[PDB]
Design a protein around this ligand. Structure first.
Ligand code: C8E
Ligand code: C8E
Ligand code: LDA
Ligand code: LDA
Ligand code: LDA
Ligand code: LDA
Ligand code: LDA
Lengths: 282, 291, 284
């Protein structure tokens, strides 16, 4: 099977099939904005290991490193806060390919992914103007099952995916933004679901190009301060649309370059995200 | 023959030169986010029911009924929401005439007009009810479903093949008719009758498309609609225009056409809003069944 | 050959091979809808002359003509409009040199310089009245020099391309650097410098037509003022980030004439919401 074809499937399905072991290195820049104003610049380095078994099972571990740099403007006045390279919410996932593509069926793949609360929690960080530090994960355990369907209708390859996320309830020693007090509390982050569709083409032996779209929807998040009852956090629910354009480029027989632009379609998504990924196959 | 070519043309022109009678079902989602009041989020679902009759690749007649479902959140801090369970929208109908057949030097041209009737729930006389939590947060008592008036919209389409790429374009404009109402205030304490005149508007856009294979097509296109501002005239006052009622709504579109079985087509389309007067995005799926 | 390939290269690289003299007329419409709401509609007619010397050197001069309409609404609602009838902008000119020719392993490489004179109406003199300006500028008021670089390369049927440049602005000075009607302050200005890059991909659809997808960013550093008083100062929100996503075509109308439609979608708040353009290079 051509090289371009193998890589279109790997990018689309999340399943690195032709091969056994792989280490992926990702670099990603994203950019946010607002009215006061508020610029932000996020760099993330992804490190990923993957073990693929017979092209039927797959296991992966993932470690993000996060450098961040924000600006809060309000007055005449402008002020920065930043965050030198730290982890990261660490996560692993398992995947099973249950249908292999035939003339009637597609390539179907079910998966699970568990994310641990290893980064710097937002809750308990203190403060017009301005935070003491920037977080690097959400502070909670989460578990996300999902599904990928992929199929070739020569020369198109259509693909899609759906997934939902459950966050587990968790408690914090401090829950207050106010520098003076220290209140502790429980948190139920709202569940969420995600989906996307797209089309791709093998342009030649080594290159492929992809168009796609996805939307993420985040249910409302509730809080329990010590003493009081439950209550929902206003403005906490979200809708983050993305339109994506992408390529795939075979460098060696084992190296691939994967560039991707992702244009935020709503306010809840960053303005744009350029990304760059380098899977290596031993 | 075609049949991706044929599907592609029906989409680009708005003219099913193919068969005779057909019936299109459409579902469409659209997200809004805006910014007294601080932000207003909105989820809009629409089911379209459309019947059309094509005649000899020369005339076409069409009827459309939208069913509308909307949900809207009003933030100030605190927050409240409001709904509209499936009611009908502005029913409308359309005539079109193919005045140029495509050739080695001329395109497919199609002149047409579309008339729209105020069957939906209008926005005039819907009251702002202050809650009940934020104390200077005003929230509408119900949500509208059409714009309360009649309108006529003539328009034109041009389509030409330059193998393998099919260019296309279109222009139209909407004249709205003046109407009167028992109540046009949104104050719960007062009732003020009046007449209203919505701003007329014009739309245009261009695109390209391709037959990827015997059964699929893909397209890219762009558009802009521009709207003159609207006016109200209480009794017995004079016409006053309303600031911010003017608009410019630009859209960028990716779409496909997929032939499921000769009778059925599936037509997915993403429209990305480029301006604040357009919704942020709009997915849609349409299912023309050909009898 | 083909013409589709040639037109496509001229568009990615900014460098017309395959001709001697040429004249380009371009028309651009841009839409701003910002934050108080400053809504604005700009058109620009661009007139450009071009001389390529043996597919090696090239000299261009460009004259922009600029029409504007802005509209400001109350806040600290009622609208008020301002406009600026056709008026010459920031005349510029550039030289270019192709240092690598495309082979089985080499890209097509062009190095270049663009010099921009301050021939348009400067922003600094202009006065606020009431809270709205009594006119609109047509350029930025300073000299600037801009070296650039570009690469293009076929990997059949894909043509990959990319480019990068920076702009250095030259410190200047003005009789009036204020906008308060009741005050006339002299001073000296350093417009912040900037770094532009973008990348992209393009395909020949047939012997006449090409299609293009690309993206680019512009990063601008902060501007500074020195009043007569008086030492240097940062203007607080003068820095910028303007990102863009582009879809385009080239159509071969005839042997001499290409039509170039381009849509550019603003992705950040420091960019027009959108921009349409048509260009008509004519090759004598
Ligand atoms: C009209 C713009 C050209 C300005 C640069 C001067 C070019 C002189 O080149 C001489 C080349 O011919 C040598 C034979
Ligand atoms: C918007 C499309 C994004 C994908 C294209 C990225 C291309 C990398 C780079 C210069 O090319 C010639 C080098 O040889
Ligand atoms: C970034 C917004 C959320 C995108 C949602 C995409 C669905 C995730 C499905 C998991 C399967 C893996 N893969 C690569 C197809 O995404
Ligand atoms: C795509 C789904 C958009 C979510 C809007 C909520 C409406 N819904 C499905 C609950 O009825
Ligand atoms: C489609 C967006 C362009 C607006 C013009 C509509 C004319 N049309 C397609 C009905 O003929
Ligand atoms: C931003 C564009 C950089 C200037 C030089 C390259 N280009 C494509 C215009 O020729
Ligand atoms: C400012 C430069 C403008 C270009 C000058 C106009 C030249 C007119 C000649 C038109 C050519 C017609 N033709 C090819 C049939 O000869």
């Amino acid at each position: 099977p051509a090289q371009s074809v193998s890589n279109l499937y790997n990018e689309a399905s999340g399943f690195a099939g032709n091969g056994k072991f792989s280490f992926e290195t990702g670099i990603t820049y994203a950019r946010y904005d607002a009215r006061d104003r508020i610029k932000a610049d996020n760099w993330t380095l992804d490190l990923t290991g993957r073990y693929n078994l017979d092209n039927r099972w797959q296991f992966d571990v993932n470690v993000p490193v996060v450098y961040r740099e924000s600006t809060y403007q309000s007055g005449t006045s402008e002020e920065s806060v930043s965050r030198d390279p730290t982890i990261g919410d660490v996560n692993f996932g398992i995947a099973y390919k249950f249908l292999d593509e035939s003339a009637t069926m597609p390539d179907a793949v079910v998966s699970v992914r568990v994310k641990a609360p290893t980064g710097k929690e937002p809750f308990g960080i203190k403060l017009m103007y301005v935070p003491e530090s920037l977080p690097t994960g959400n502070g909670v355990w989460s578990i996300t099952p999902g599904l990928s369907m992929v199929k070739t209708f020569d020369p198109a390859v259509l693909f899609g995916s759906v997934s939902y996320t459950h966050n587990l309830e968790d408690s914090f020693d401090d829950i207050s933004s106010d520098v003076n007090q220290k209140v502790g509390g429980k948190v139920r982050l709202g569940d969420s679901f995600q989906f996307g569709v797209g089309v791709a083409f093998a342009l030649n032996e080594r290159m492929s190009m992809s168009f796609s779209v996805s939307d993420l929807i985040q249910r409302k998040s509730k809080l329990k301060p010590d003493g009081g009852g439950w209550q929902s956090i206003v403005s906490s629910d979200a809708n983050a649309g993305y339109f994506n354009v992408g390529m795939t480029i075979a460098a060696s027989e084992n190296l691939t370059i994967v560039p991707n632009l992702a244009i935020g379609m709503t306010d809840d998504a960053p303005d744009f995200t350029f990304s760059l990924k380098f899977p290596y196959y031993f």
